[PDB]
Amino acid sequence: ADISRSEVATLIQEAYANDLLASAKKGSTVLQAFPTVNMGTKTTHLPVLA
Amino acid sequence: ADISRSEVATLIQEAYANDLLASAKKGSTVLQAFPTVNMGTKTTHLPVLA
Numbered sequence: 001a002d003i004s005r006s007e008v009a010t011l012i013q014e015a016y017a018n019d020l021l022a023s024a025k026k027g028s029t030v031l032q033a034f035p036t037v038n039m040g041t042k043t044t045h046l047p048v049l050a
Numbered sequence: 051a052d053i054s055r056s057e058v059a060t061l062i063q064e065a066y067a068n069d070l071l072a073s074a075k076k077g078s079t080v081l082q083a084f085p086t087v088n089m090g091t092k093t094t095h096l097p098v099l100a
Binding site: 007008009010011013 | 095096097100
């Protein structure tokens with residue numbers, strides 16, 4: 001006669017840890033690479049020589 | 051001749067009182083009868099003797 005881990009049941013609580021949870025978020029490439037403009041309205045016109 | 055109650059009209063006004071509704075509502079029988087566990091998440095494990 002002896003006491004097994006299964007015979008102790010839920011007197012032994014399983015633990016939790018968030019170590020693996022976090023992942024670094026990545027931004028748009030095009031917002032890093034190119035000059036941006038702050039728009040005040042839906043549409044902006046930019047003339048070019050053609 | 052005489053001024054009756056109806057001839058005085060809305061100078062006499064009715065009153066309101068909630069004494070018939072001012073009664074404690076009926077609680078749960080099992081929350082009165084049995085002890086309780088303050089759970090923090092969907093599931094709790096309780097060991098029992100076997």
